[PDB]
Amino acid sequence: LAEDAPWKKIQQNTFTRWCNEHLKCVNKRIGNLQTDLSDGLRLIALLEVLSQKRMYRKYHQRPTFRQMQLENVSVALEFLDRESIKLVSIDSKAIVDGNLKLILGLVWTLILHYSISMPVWEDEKKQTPKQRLLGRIQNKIPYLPITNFNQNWQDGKALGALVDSCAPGLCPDWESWDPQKPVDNAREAMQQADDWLGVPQVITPEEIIHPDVDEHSVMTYLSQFPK
């Protein structure tokens, strides 16, 4: 009966914004993740931007027929396999036919690989991408216990700590912030990061402090922090 705005919607929203931040640079955009990858073209474009390589296989530039759309998605999935990016439970018809569950899974694989796992973090790897992101954020704010990507972020004040850590003076009074004003706190921190640290708001202040936020969404946002 709550098929409206859970962690599930936050995650679709966040994964869509992340894709769109990348698609911007080739003049494309997704309105609806369930439908707008289904002909393969926006998926191919996203993969080319993330990898900085073109497709080596031909594909259908006007995929008006189902078979053309299946083949475009196959070209994209095959490209990822070649890049040794590990996919699970995904085939071409899953994308073409709008299996939202499996589409979200694919986009998470891309985020984990290109945003979390591939960049060389602060201190230059037997630990998972998640552990590495936690440690990286923990080191920027050594006076707060950073052990998750949900409850630690709920009062909006750790965002202020992280942003000010990156450029002292952006959120200097973060510790004095009212923990009962979480959207206010998150909004200020995240707008400072947007305006001055180049961090896009792929999750929103309302979303990031929501009691039902999923960790993947928060990780997607936090993985963008500089240096």
UniProtKB/Swiss-Prot annotation:
Residues 1-227 are annotated as: Actin-binding. Residues 9-115, 127-227 form the Calponin-homology (CH) domain. The modification Phosphothreonine is found at T204. ISGylation prevents ability to interact with the upstream activators of the JNK cascade and inhibits IFNA-induced JNK signaling. Ubiquitination by a SCF-like complex containing ASB2 isoform 1 leads to proteasomal degradation which promotes muscle differentiation. Disulfide bonds: none annotated. It comes from the Eukaryota. Ubiquitous. Isoform 1 and isoform 2 are expressed in placenta, bone marrow, brain, umbilical vein endothelial cells (HUVEC), retina and skeletal muscle. Isoform 1 is predominantly expressed in prostate, uterus, liver, thyroid, stomach, lymph node, small intestine, spleen, skeletal muscle, kidney, placenta, pancreas, heart, lung, platelets, endothelial cells, megakaryocytic and erythroleukemic cell lines. Isoform 2 is predominantly expressed in spinal cord, platelet and Daudi cells. Homodimer. Interacts with MICALL2. Interacts with RFLNA and RFLNB. Isoform 1 interacts with FBLP1, FLNA, FLNC, GP1BA, INPPL1, ITGB1A, PSEN1 and PSEN2. Isoform 3 interacts with ITGB1A, ITGB1D, ITGB3 and ITGB6. Interacts with MYOT and MYOZ1. Interacts with HBV capsid protein. Interacts with ASB2 isoform 1; the interaction targets FLNB for proteasomal degradation. Belongs to the filamin family. It is linked to Interaction with FLNA may compensate for dysfunctional FLNA homodimer in the periventricular nodular heterotopia (PVNH) disorder. Atelosteogenesis 1: A lethal chondrodysplasia characterized by distal hypoplasia of the humeri and femurs, hypoplasia of the mid-thoracic spine, occasionally complete lack of ossification of single hand bones, and the finding in cartilage of multiple degenerated chondrocytes which are encapsulated in fibrous tissue. Comprised of a NH2-terminal actin-binding domain, 24 internally homologous repeats and two hinge regions. Repeat 24 and the second hinge domain are important for dimer formation. The first hinge region prevents binding to ITGA and ITGB subunits. Connects cell membrane constituents to the actin cytoskeleton. May promote orthogonal branching of actin filaments and links actin filaments to membrane glycoproteins. Anchors various transmembrane proteins to the actin cytoskeleton. Interaction with FLNA may allow neuroblast migration from the ventricular zone into the cortical plate. Various interactions and localizations of isoforms affect myotube morphology and myogenesis. Isoform 6 accelerates muscle differentiation in vitro. This is Filamin-B.
